[PDB]
Amino acid sequence: EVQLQQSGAELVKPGASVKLSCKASGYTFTSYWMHWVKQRPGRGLEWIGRIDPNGGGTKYNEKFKSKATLTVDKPSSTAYMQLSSLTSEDSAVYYCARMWYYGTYYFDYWGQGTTLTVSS
Amino acid sequence: EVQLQQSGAELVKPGASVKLSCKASGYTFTSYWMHWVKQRPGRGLEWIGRIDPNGGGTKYNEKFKSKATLTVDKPSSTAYMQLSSLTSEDSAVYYCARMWYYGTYYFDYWGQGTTLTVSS
Amino acid sequence: EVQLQQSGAELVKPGASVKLSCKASGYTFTSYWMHWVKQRPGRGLEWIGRIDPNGGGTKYNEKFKSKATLTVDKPSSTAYMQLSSLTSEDSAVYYCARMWYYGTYYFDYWGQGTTLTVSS
Amino acid sequence: EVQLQQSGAELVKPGASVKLSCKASGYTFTSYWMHWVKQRPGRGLEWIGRIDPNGGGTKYNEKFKSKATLTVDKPSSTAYMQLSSLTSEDSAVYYCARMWYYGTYYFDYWGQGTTLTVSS
Amino acid sequence: QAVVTQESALTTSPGETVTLTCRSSTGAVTTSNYANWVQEKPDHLFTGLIGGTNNRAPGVPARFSGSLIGNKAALTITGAQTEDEAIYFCALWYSNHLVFGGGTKLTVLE
Amino acid sequence: QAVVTQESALTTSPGETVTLTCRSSTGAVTTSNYANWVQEKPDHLFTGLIGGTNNRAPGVPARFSGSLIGNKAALTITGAQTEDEAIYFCALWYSNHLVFGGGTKLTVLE
Amino acid sequence: QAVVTQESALTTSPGETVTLTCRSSTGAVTTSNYANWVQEKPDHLFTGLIGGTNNRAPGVPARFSGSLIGNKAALTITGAQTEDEAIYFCALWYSNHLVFGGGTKLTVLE
Amino acid sequence: QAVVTQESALTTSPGETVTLTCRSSTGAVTTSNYANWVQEKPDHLFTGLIGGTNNRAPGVPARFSGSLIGNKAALTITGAQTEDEAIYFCALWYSNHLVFGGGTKLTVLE
Numbered sequence: 001e002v003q004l005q006q007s008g009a010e011l012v013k014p015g016a017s018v019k020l021s022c023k024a025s026g027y028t029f030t031s032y033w034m035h036w037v038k039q040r041p042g043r044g045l046e047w048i049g050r051i052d053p054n055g056g057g058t059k060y061n062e063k064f065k066s067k068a069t070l071t072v073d074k075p076s077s078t079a080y081m082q083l084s085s086l087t088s089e090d091s092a093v094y095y096c097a098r099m100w101y102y103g104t105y106y107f108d109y110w111g112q113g114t115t116l117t118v119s120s
Numbered sequence: 121e122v123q124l125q126q127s128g129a130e131l132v133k134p135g136a137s138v139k140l141s142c143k144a145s146g147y148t149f150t151s152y153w154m155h156w157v158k159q160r161p162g163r164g165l166e167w168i169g170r171i172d173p174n175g176g177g178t179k180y181n182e183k184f185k186s187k188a189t190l191t192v193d194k195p196s197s198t199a200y201m202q203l204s205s206l207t208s209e210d211s212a213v214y215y216c217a218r219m220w221y222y223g224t225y226y227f228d229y230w231g232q233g234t235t236l237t238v239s240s
Numbered sequence: 241e242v243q244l245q246q247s248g249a250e251l252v253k254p255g256a257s258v259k260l261s262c263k264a265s266g267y268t269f270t271s272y273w274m275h276w277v278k279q280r281p282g283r284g285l286e287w288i289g290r291i292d293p294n295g296g297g298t299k300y301n302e303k304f305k306s307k308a309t310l311t312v313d314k315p316s317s318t319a320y321m322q323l324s325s326l327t328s329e330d331s332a333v334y335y336c337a338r339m340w341y342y343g344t345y346y347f348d349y350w351g352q353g354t355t356l357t358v359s360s
Numbered sequence: 361e362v363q364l365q366q367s368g369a370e371l372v373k374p375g376a377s378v379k380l381s382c383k384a385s386g387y388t389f390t391s392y393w394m395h396w397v398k399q400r401p402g403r404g405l406e407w408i409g410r411i412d413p414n415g416g417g418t419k420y421n422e423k424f425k426s427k428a429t430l431t432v433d434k435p436s437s438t439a440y441m442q443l444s445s446l447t448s449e450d451s452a453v454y455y456c457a458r459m460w461y462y463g464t465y466y467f468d469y470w471g472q473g474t475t476l477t478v479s480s
Numbered sequence: 481q482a483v484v485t486q487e488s489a490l491t492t493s494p495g496e497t498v499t500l501t502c503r504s505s506t507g508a509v510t511t512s513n514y515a516n517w518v519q520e521k522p523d524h525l526f527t528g529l530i531g532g533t534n535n536r537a538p539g540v541p542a543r544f545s546g547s548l549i550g551n552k553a554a555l556t557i558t559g560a561q562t563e564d565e566a567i568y569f570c571a572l573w574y575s576n577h578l579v580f581g582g583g584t585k586l587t588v589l590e
Numbered sequence: 591q592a593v594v595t596q597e598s599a600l601t602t603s604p605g606e607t608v609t610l611t612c613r614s615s616t617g618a619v620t621t622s623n624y625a626n627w628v629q630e631k632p633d634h635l636f637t638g639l640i641g642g643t644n645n646r647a648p649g650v651p652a653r654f655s656g657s658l659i660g661n662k663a664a665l666t667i668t669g670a671q672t673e674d675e676a677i678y679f680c681a682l683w684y685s686n687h688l689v690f691g692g693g694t695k696l697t698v699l700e
Numbered sequence: 701q702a703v704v705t706q707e708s709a710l711t712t713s714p715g716e717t718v719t720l721t722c723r724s725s726t727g728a729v730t731t732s733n734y735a736n737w738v739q740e741k742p743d744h745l746f747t748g749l750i751g752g753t754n755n756r757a758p759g760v761p762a763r764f765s766g767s768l769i770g771n772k773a774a775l776t777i778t779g780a781q782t783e784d785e786a787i788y789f790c791a792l793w794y795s796n797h798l799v800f801g802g803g804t805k806l807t808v809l810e
Numbered sequence: 811q812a813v814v815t816q817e818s819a820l821t822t823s824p825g826e827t828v829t830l831t832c833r834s835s836t837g838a839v840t841t842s843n844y845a846n847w848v849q850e851k852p853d854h855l856f857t858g859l860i861g862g863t864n865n866r867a868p869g870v871p872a873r874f875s876g877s878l879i880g881n882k883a884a885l886t887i888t889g890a891q892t893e894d895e896a897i898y899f900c901a902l903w904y905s906n907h908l909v910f911g912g913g914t915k916l917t918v919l920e
C-alpha cells in the first residue's frame with residue numbers, strides 16, 4: 001500500500017480490440033507515471049508502453065507502435081492499455097506498474113496483472 | 121455438505137457425443153436449480169447452461185445452443201450435460217453447481233468437476 | 241516394499257522402436273502378473289497390456305494390438321513393453337504394476353513410471 | 361560455493377545467432393573443464409558440448425556440430441555457448457557446469473541455467 | 481455480452497480486513513443478480529461461500545459477508561487468517577445463467 | 591468399451607470417515623473385477639493400497655478397507671489424517687487387463 | 701535493443717548476506733536508469749522493493765538496499781531469512797520505457 | 811549412442827539407507843566415466859553432490875557416498891532426512907562429453 005487495481009481477466013477473439021485498466025487507490029495521477037508489462041510463459045516479462053494524462057506521453061516500441069496504445073482517465077482516475085487487432089499471440093498476463101518518480105520517497109506497487117485469453 | 125457428485129474423468133473423440141452427470145447427495149431436485157461451468161486453462165471459468173426437471177428450463181447461449189444441452193433424471197435423481205459433435209476444443213473441466221435459490225438458507229456446493237479429454 | 245524397478249527416461253524418434261523394462265526386486269515371476277499403464281497429461285491413466293513368462297499371455301487392445309507388445313526375461317527376471325512404429329502421440333509416462341493375484345496376501349507396488357519423449 | 365554465473369534469460373528469433381555465458385567466481389580457468397546441458401520439458405537434460413581455453417577442445421555431437429559451438433574468454437574469464445541458426449526447437453534452459461577434474465578435491469557447481477525463448 | 485470485473489489480486493495481513501469488489505458491465509449489480517462468491521484453493525477445488533448477495537453457506541464463519549456497495553457487489557473478510565489465502569471468484573445471475581469474473585487472488589502474509 | 595466411474599473430489603475433516611465409490615459401466619462390480627485402490631500423491635507417485643476388492647498392501651493401516659456395496663466397489667478411510675490427502679484411483683480387472691477411473695481427489699481440511 | 705543481464709540463481713543461508721547484479725548492454729547502468737528491484741513470489745505476485753537505484757518501498761526492511769557498483773546496479777540483502785526466497789527481477793528505465801532482466805531466483809536453505 | 815539408465819523413483823523413510831544405481835549401455839561404468847551425482851530440487855535447481863565416482867562437493871555430508879558396484883555406479887544415502895527428498899540425476903563422461911540418465915526421484919515419508 002498504496003495499491004494498484006487491474007481487472008482479473010478478459011476474453012477476446014482474433015481481430016477484435018480490447019482495453020485493460022489500471023486504477024490508483026489513494027494517489028496523484030497528475031504527478032506520476034505508468035507502465036504496461038507483458039508476461040508470457042517463458043518469455044519472461046516484456047516491457048511495452050507508457051502514459052501521461054495532460055498533453056500526453058504514452059511511449060511504445062516499433063512492434064507496439066501499431067496495435068498497442070496507452071491512455072488515462074480523469075474524473076474517476078484510470079490508466080489504459082489498448083490492443084487493437086488482437087492476435088492469438090497477444091494472450092498473456094499484462095501488468096501495470098504506478099507511483100512516485102517525481103522526487104519524493106517510496107515506491108510503485110505493481111497491479112495484479114490482467115490475464116488476456118484469445119480465443120475460446 | 122450437503123454435497124455434489126460428478127464423475128472424475130471422461131474420454132471421447134472428435135465427432136462423438138458425451139454425457140456428464142451431477143448428483144445430489146441429500147436434497148430436493150424439485151425445488152432448486154443447476155449450472156454447468158467450463159474451466160479451460162487460462163480461459164478461466166465460462167458459464168454454459170441450466171436445468172429444470174418437470175416441464176423444463178435448460179438455458180444456454182448462441183454458441184452452446186447447438187451441441188451443448190442440459191437435463192434431469194427422476195428415480196435416482198441426476199442432472200445432465202450433453203456435448204454432441206465433440207471437438208478437440210471441448211476439452212476442459214466441467215463444473216456442475218447445486219442447491220437453494222428457492223427462498224431458504226444455505227448454499228450450493230460446487231461438484232468436483234469432470235475432466236473431459238478429446239482425443240487419445 | 242517389495243519394490244518395482246523401471247528406467248527413469250527414454251528418448252526416441254518417430255518411426256523407431258523402443259523397449260521399456262520392469263524389474264522385480266525380491267519376488268517370484270513364475271507366480272504373478274504384469275501391467276503397463278499410460279498416463280498422458282489430462283488423459284489420465286490408460287490401461288494398455290499384460291504378460292506371462294512361460295508359454296505366454298500378454299494381452300492388449302485393438303489399438304495396442306499393433307505397435308504395443310509385452311514380454312518377460314528369465315535369468316535376470318524382467319517384464320518388457322515394446323513400442324514399434326513410435327509416434328509423437330506415444331509420448332507419456334508408462335507405469336508398470338507387479339505382484340500377488342495368485343491367492344496369497346499383500347499387494348503390487350506400482351514402478352515409478354518411464355517418461356518416454358518423442359522426439360528432440 | 362565456489363559458484364557459477366549465467367545470465368537469467370535471453371530472447372531470440374528464428375534464424376538469428378545467440379551467445380550464452382558462464383562465469384567462474386573464484387577459480388582457475390587454466391586447469392579445469394566446462395559443459396553445456398539442455399533441459400527441455402520432458403526431454404530431461406541433454407548433454408551438448410565442451411571447452412578448453414588455450415589451444416582448444418570444445419566437443420559437441422553430429423547434431424550439435426553445426427549451429428552449436430563453445431568457447432572461452434581470458435581477461436575477464438568466461439565460457440561461451442553459441443547457437444547459430446536459431447530455431448523454435450532451440451527454446452529450453454541451458455545449464456553450464458564448472459570445476460576440478462584435474463586431480464584435486466571438491467566439485468563443480470552447476471550454473472543456474474539460461475532460459476532461451478524463441479520467439480515473441 | 482455481460483462482462484464481470486473484479487480485481488486481480490489483493491495482498492493482506494492476518495487479523496486485517498479486506499474487501500473484494502465485483503462490477504456488472506450491464507449497469508448496477510442488483511439483487512436480481514444474486515451475487516455469488518466462491519473460494520478456490522489449489523488443485524481446482526471450488527467452494528461456494530456466499531449466494532444471493534449476502535447468504536452464507538453452512539459453516540462459513542460470520543467473518544465473511546457479502547453486500548451491495550454503490551453499483552458493485554462486495555465480499556468483505558474480517559480478521560483474515562493464513563488459511564484464507566485463495567482465489568475468490570464472483571458469479572452473477574443474468575436471468576437464466578451465471579457469468580464469472582476472473583477471480584481475485586488473495587495473498588495473506590503470512 | 592468398459593468405463594469406470596468414480597467421484598471427482600470429496601472434502602473431509604481429520605478423524606472423520608470418508609467413502610469412495612467405483613462403478614462398472616458393464617454392470618455390477620464383482621469379485622472377478624478384483625477392485626484395485628491406488629493412492630497418488632504429487633509428482634506422479636502411485637502406491638497400491640488395496641487389491642482384489644479388500645486385500646491390503648503391507649503396512650497400509652487397517653483404517654483403509656475395501657468392499658463391494660450394491661453394484662459398486664467402495665474404499666472407506668477411517669479416522670482421516672492430513673497425510674491422507676491424495677488422489678485415489680480405482681482400477682478394475684476385465685479378464686486380462688485393468689481399466690482405470692479418473693481418480694477421486696480427497697481434500698482434508700486440515 | 702537494450703538487453704538487461706542478471707544472474708539466473710543464487711543459493712544462500714539465513715543470516716547471510718547476498719548480492720544480485722544487473723548490467724546494461726548499452727554501457728554503464730547509471731542513475732538515469734533508476735534501477736528497479738521487484739520481488740516475485742509463487743503465483744505471479746510482483747512486489748516493488750526498490751526504485752531509482754536505492755529508494756525503498758514503504759516497509760521494505762533496511763536489510764534490502766540498492767546501489768550502483770562499477771558499471772552495474774546491485775541489490776544486497778542483509779541477514780537473509782527463509783521468507784526472502786523469491787525471484788528478484790531488475791528493470792531499467794531507458795528514457796521512456798522499462799526493460800527487464802530474466803530475474804534472479806534466490807534460494808535460501810533454509 | 812550411449813544411454814544411461816537409472817531407476818525412476820525410490821520411496822524411503824528417515825534414518826533409513828537408500829541406494830541409487832546408474833548403468834552404462836556401452837558396457838561397465840568404469841572410473842574413466844567419472845560418475846556424477848547431482849541433486850535437483852523444485853524450480854530447476856541443480857546441485858553437484860559427487861564427481862568422479864566418489865568425490866564429495868564441499869559440505870556434502872559423509873552420509874552421501876558414491877561407488878562402483880558390479881557394472882554400475884551407485885549413490886548411497888545413509889540416515890535419510892526429509893530434506894533429502896529430491897531428483898538425483900546420474901551423468902557419465904564418455905571421453906569428451908557427459909550423458910545424463912532420467913533422474914531418480916527420491917521420496918522420503920516423511
Ligand SMILES: Oc1c2ccccc2cc2ccccc12
Pocket residue numbers: 032033034101733734736751752793798
Ligand atoms: O516514469 C518514470 C519516470 C518519468 C520521468 C522521469 C524519470 C522517470 C523514471 C522512472 C523510473 C522507473 C519507472 C518509471 C519512471
Ligand SMILES: Oc1c2ccccc2cc2ccccc12
Pocket residue numbers: 152153154221513514516531532573578
Ligand atoms: O437458479 C437460480 C435461480 C433460479 C430461479 C430464480 C433465481 C435464481 C437465482 C440464482 C442465483 C445464483 C445461481 C442460481 C440461481
Ligand SMILES: Oc1c2ccccc2cc2ccccc12
Pocket residue numbers: 272273274341623624626641642683688
Ligand atoms: O493379473 C491379474 C490376474 C491374473 C489372473 C487371475 C486374476 C487376476 C486378477 C488381477 C487383478 C488385478 C490386477 C492383476 C490381476
Ligand SMILES: Oc1c2ccccc2cc2ccccc12
Pocket residue numbers: 392393394461843844846861862903908
Ligand atoms: O572435463 C572433464 C574431464 C576432463 C579431462 C579428463 C577427465 C575429465 C573428467 C570429467 C568428468 C566429469 C565432468 C567433466 C570431466
